[PDB]
């Protein structure tokens, strides 16, 4: 068993973690000897200095001591981690600044046992007390059409209902009073009885047993925190251990056939009925479907602008390139990814036709001319029932940015028709098809020149329509300059 | 090989603390220039050099030594033997200009109270 | 993005609009002789 | 003249410390093997092979 432990250990730092996370529930003792090897391994790192390793045994810590059913009192394992985990404050940032929230989250677990994976699952749930109240849900935005079959059946799957508010106070309180005594109390007797009483009185027990834990968590020393907590749950009270695993969590499987995010408002009309808080939408994500991004892009802007969904909820993004295995992983994935990565959005400086001035972002591409034209009439529909391009003369000054801060600047004066801006500090592609000679047939010459600052300057009689990042349905014209630099709800990434 | 340019930098800086960030240094063009500890004033067409020193969430101090007996010293006190004193005192007899090989050196070291 | 004009029986205004759901009536007999708007007739919430 | 008026080794390590009360690190406490990042060279005027050499 160890040596099969290690072979997998060997193998999963290279579906071989649900393959870890799914050999050690079986058996109660599976879950201390694993521990031991990944400080073994983590010592070596300490040891060496091989930077690129310490992430995922700081997870796969977090992930099994959060599943172990019951740590021994005898057995010293979180000391020994906790020392091990000490000397890497000595390490370049990020990697302190992960053993440091390991270290936290490892007196969490000193002193109050199970109350990292209390709060968890209380959250999750939505099971929560009056006193530490919240909530996490799941919404899975998918489109019929371009999801998998497969997919579309782990969904289904994970959307039903599967515990109650009864069955889920049952085993809270198994797992809270199993963590604490060990083998020593009886779950057979205490589930039999537990079942009996009703949700009330479950729900009372319930919420003594969280501010119990987490009071005890609060206490500054560990050694009596452990007795403290004992003597309380025997107050408000060998065998075999039992491997108690995560309850799934609630999930909401609504069709997005869209492209923009406004289906989420709609959803949180059924929310003023179904209640800080947090919400999942695991976005599940095509090639094309660039426009995800594209609706990114409103709701960070639009809702840090006109707060509607944040009010009560901190969103939280995910991305699937598209129990069964598919249904565990992805669970997991959601549960234990907590690092979001944020993509680059550029900054638009615009002076309208009028005069008026407000700073823009254009996320994905910038579109200008013919291009923004043949968008606006794409998204006139009758208009485009009842509706070649005159070039439009822009002065632009492109300036070649580097870390240096030596600008080396450029400009020239030109007639094109369209200009679109295209990604590749970033670098931005750049097409400029000019009218080498106007008419109902322009001289088209695609210039592409790598620009990472721009400023486009428009005669005030010529308005040029601007398109940013493909939206079709919100192109601007009447601008006579505009000048282009590189400038809650992340996106979220393992790794 | 022909060298062009070259920089200095000190990674402890004058307060006793060690260098983290990004620095851009100018290059001087190609002695006690070659140990040189300053910036090219040429900022507009001189060689510029990027690098990066890893962060650290606190800062990297450097203690004070502190003064302790030395008793490898103190009570080591007997008139070596002849032979090591003669070869100790014909190889501080040289001028200034003579590169002490490493045999040197390691005699000297433990020798650091005759 | 004009969509529609109008010549007035009078002679002396012209109206016109489109996409900007805004009915701009100009004034040919101008105090100036010049071609100004007279009016920007806005408060319909579609394009007219 | 206006301008007016302008520690040890035990005190500077993270070991026998909680880590609460943590403000600054020893340099003698970082076993790591130095290492600096270089980005690149730019030089904005023409003057092959060239290769920088840290020592």
């Given at each position: 068993?160890?040596?099969?432990?290690?072979?997998?250990?060997?193998?999963?730092?290279?579906?071989?973690?649900?393959?870890?996370?799914?050999?050690?529930?079986?058996?109660?003792?599976?879950?201390?000897?694993?521990?031991?090897?990944?400080?073994?391994?983590?010592?070596?790192?300490?040891?060496?200095?091989?930077?690129?390793?310490?992430?995922?045994?700081?997870?796969?810590?977090?992930?099994?001591?959060?599943?172990?059913?019951?740590?021994?009192?005898?057995?010293?394992?979180?000391?020994?981690?906790?020392?091990?985990?000490?000397?890497?404050?000595?390490?370049?940032?990020?990697?302190?600044?992960?053993?440091?929230?390991?270290?936290?989250?490892?007196?969490?677990?000193?002193?109050?046992?199970?109350?990292?994976?209390?709060?968890?699952?209380?959250?999750?749930?939505?099971?929560?007390?009056?006193?530490?109240?919240?909530?996490?849900?799941?919404?899975?935005?998918?489109?019929?059409?371009?999801?998998?079959?497969?997919?579309?059946?782990?969904?289904?799957?994970?959307?039903?209902?599967?515990?109650s508010?009864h069955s889920?106070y049952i085993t809270?309180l198994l797992?809270?009073?199993?963590?604490?005594?060990?083998?020593?109390?009886?779950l057979s007797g205490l589930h039999r009885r537990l079942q009996s009483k009703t949700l009330?009185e479950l729900?009372?027990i319930?919420?003594?047993?969280?501010?119990?834990?987490?009071?005890?968590?609060?206490?500054?020393?560990?050694?009596?925190?452990?007795?403290?907590?004992?003597?309380?749950?025997?107050?408000?009270?060998?065998?075999?251990?039992?491997?108690?695993?995560?309850?799934?969590?609630?999930?909401?499987?609504?069709?997005?056939?869209?492209?923009?995010?406004?289906?989420?408002?709609?959803?949180?009309?059924?929310?003023?009925?179904?209640?800080?808080?947090?919400?999942?939408?695991?976005?599940?994500?095509?090639?094309?479907?660039?426009?995800?991004?594209?609706?990114?892009?409103?709701?960070?802007?639009?809702?840090?602008?006109?707060?509607?969904?944040?009010?009560?909820?901190?969103?939280?993004?995910?991305?699937?390139?598209?129990?069964?295995?598919?249904?565990?992983?992805?669970?997991?994935?959601?549960?234990?990814?907590?690092?979001?990565?944020?993509?680059?959005?550029?900054?638009?400086?615009?002076?309208?036709?009028?005069?008026?001035?407000?700073?823009?972002?254009?996320?994905?591409?910038?579109?200008?001319?013919?291009?923004?034209?043949?968008?606006?009439?794409?998204?006139?529909?009758?208009?485009?029932?009842?509706?070649?391009?005159?070039?439009?003369?822009?002065?632009?000054?492109?300036?070649?940015?580097?870390?240096?801060?030596?600008?080396?600047?450029?400009?020239?004066?030109?007639?094109?028709?369209?200009?679109?801006?295209?990604?590749?500090?970033?670098?931005?592609?750049?097409?400029?098809?000019?009218?080498?000679?106007?008419?109902?047939?322009?001289?088209?010459?695609?210039?592409?020149?790598?620009?990472?600052?721009?400023?486009?300057?428009?005669?005030?009689?010529?308005?040029?329509?601007?398109?940013?990042?493909?939206?079709?349905?919100?192109?601007?014209?009447?601008?006579?300059?505009?000048?282009?630099?590189?400038?809650?709800?992340?996106?979220?990434?393992?790794? | 090989?022909?060298?062009?340019?070259?920089?200095?930098?000190?990674?402890?800086?004058?307060?006793?603390?060690?260098?983290?960030?990004?620095?851009?240094?100018?290059?001087?063009?190609?002695?006690?220039?070659?140990?040189?500890?300053?910036?090219?004033?040429?900022?507009?067409?001189?060689?510029?050099?990027?690098?990066?020193?890893?962060?650290?969430?606190?800062?990297?101090?450097?203690?004070?030594?502190?003064?302790?007996?030395?008793?490898?010293?103190?009570?080591?006190?007997?008139?070596?033997?002849?032979?090591?004193?003669?070869?100790?005192?014909?190889?501080?007899?040289?001028?200034?200009?003579?590169?002490?090989?490493?045999?040197?050196?390691?005699?000297?070291?433990?020798?650091?109270?005759? | 993005?004009?969509?529609?004009?109008?010549?007035?029986?009078?002679?002396?205004?012209?109206?016109?609009?489109?996409?900007?759901?805004?009915?701009?009536?100009?004034?040919?007999?101008?105090?100036?002789?010049?071609?100004?708007?007279?009016?920007?007739?806005?408060?319909?919430?579609?394009?007219? | 003249?206006?301008?007016?008026?302008?520690?040890?080794?035990?005190?500077?390590?993270?070991?026998?410390?909680?880590?609460?009360?943590?403000?600054?690190?020893?340099?003698?406490?970082?076993?790591?093997?130095?290492?600096?990042?270089?980005?690149?060279?730019?030089?904005?005027?023409?003057?092959?092979?060239?290769?920088?050499?840290?020592?």
């Amino acid at each position: 068993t160890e040596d099969r432990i290690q072979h997998a250990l060997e193998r999963c730092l290279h579906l071989n973690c649900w393959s870890l996370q799914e050999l050690v529930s079986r058996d109660p003792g599976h879950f201390l000897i694993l521990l031991e090897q990944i400080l073994q391994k983590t010592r070596e790192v300490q040891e060496k200095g091989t930077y690129d390793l310490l992430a995922p045994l700081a997870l796969l810590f977090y992930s099994t001591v959060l599943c172990t059913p019951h740590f021994p009192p005898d057995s010293d394992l979180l000391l020994k981690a906790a020392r091990t985990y000490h000397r890497f404050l000595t390490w370049p940032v990020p990697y302190c600044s992960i053993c440091q929230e390991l270290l936290t989250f490892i007196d969490a677990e000193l002193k109050a046992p199970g109350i990292s994976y209390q709060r968890l699952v209380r959250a999750e749930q939505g099971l929560s007390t009056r006193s530490h109240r919240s909530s996490t849900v799941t919404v899975l935005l998918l489109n019929p059409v371009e999801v998998q079959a497969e997919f579309l059946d782990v969904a289904d799957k994970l959307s039903t209902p599967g515990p109650s508010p009864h069955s889920a106070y049952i085993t809270l309180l198994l797992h809270a009073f199993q963590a604490t005594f060990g083998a020593h109390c009886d779950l057979s007797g205490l589930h039999r009885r537990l079942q009996s009483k009703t949700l009330a009185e479950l729900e009372a027990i319930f919420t003594e047993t969280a501010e119990a834990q987490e009071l005890a968590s609060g206490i500054g020393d560990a050694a009596e925190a452990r007795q403290w907590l004992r003597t309380k749950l025997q107050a408000v009270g060998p065998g075999k251990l039992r491997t108690i695993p995560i309850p799934v969590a609630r999930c909401y499987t609504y069709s997005w056939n869209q492209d923009s995010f406004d289906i989420l408002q709609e959803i949180l009309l059924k929310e003023q009925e179904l209640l800080a808080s947090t919400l999942r939408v695991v976005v599940f994500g095509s090639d094309r479907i660039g426009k995800v991004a594209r609706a990114y892009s409103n709701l960070r802007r639009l809702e840090n602008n006109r707060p509607l969904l944040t009010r009560f909820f901190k969103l939280q993004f995910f991305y699937v390139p598209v129990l069964p295995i598919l249904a565990d992983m992805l669970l997991y994935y959601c549960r234990f990814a907590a690092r979001p990565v944020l993509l680059q959005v550029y900054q638009t400086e615009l002076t309208f036709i009028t005069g008026e001035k407000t700073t823009e972002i254009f996320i994905h591409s910038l579109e200008l001319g013919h291009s923004a034209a043949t968008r606006a009439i794409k998204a006139s529909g009758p208009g485009s029932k009842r509706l070649e391009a005159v070039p439009l003369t822009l002065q632009i000054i492109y300036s070649k940015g580097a870390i240096s801060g030596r600008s080396r600047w450029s400009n020239m004066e030109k007639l094109c028709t369209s200009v679109n801006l295209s990604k590749a500090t970033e670098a931005l592609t750049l097409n400029l098809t000019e009218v080498v000679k106007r008419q109902g047939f322009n001289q088209i010459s695609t210039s592409q020149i790598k620009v990472d600052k721009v400023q486009i300057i428009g005669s005030n009689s010529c308005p040029f329509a601007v398109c940013l990042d493909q939206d079709e349905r919100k192109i601007l014209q009447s601008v006579i300059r505009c000048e282009v630099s590189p400038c809650c709800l992340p996106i979220m990434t393992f790794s | 090989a022909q060298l062009l340019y070259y920089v200095n930098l000190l990674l402890i800086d004058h307060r006793f603390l060690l260098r983290h960030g990004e620095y851009v240094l100018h290059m001087w063009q190609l002695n006690a220039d070659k140990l040189t500890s300053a910036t090219n004033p040429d900022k507009e067409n001189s060689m510029s050099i990027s690098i990066l020193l890893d962060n650290y969430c606190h800062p990297i101090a450097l203690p004070k030594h502190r003064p302790t007996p030395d008793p490898e010293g103190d009570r080591v006190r007997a008139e070596m033997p002849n032979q090591l004193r003669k070869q100790l005192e014909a190889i501080i007899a040289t001028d200034p200009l003579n590169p002490l090989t490493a045999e040197d050196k390691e005699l000297l070291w433990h020798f650091r109270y005759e | 993005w004009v969509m529609t004009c109008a010549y007035a029986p009078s002679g002396n205004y012209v109206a016109c609009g489109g996409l900007d759901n805004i009915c701009s009536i100009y004034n040919l007999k101008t105090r100036e002789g010049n071609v100004r708007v007279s009016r920007e007739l806005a408060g319909h919430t579609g394009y007219l | 003249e206006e301008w007016p008026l302008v520690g040890y080794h035990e005190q500077l390590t993270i070991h026998g410390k909680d880590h609460e009360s943590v403000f600054t690190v020893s340099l003698w406490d970082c076993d790591r093997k130095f290492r600096v990042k270089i980005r690149g060279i730019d030089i904005p005027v023409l003057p092959l092979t060239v290769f920088v050499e840290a020592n």
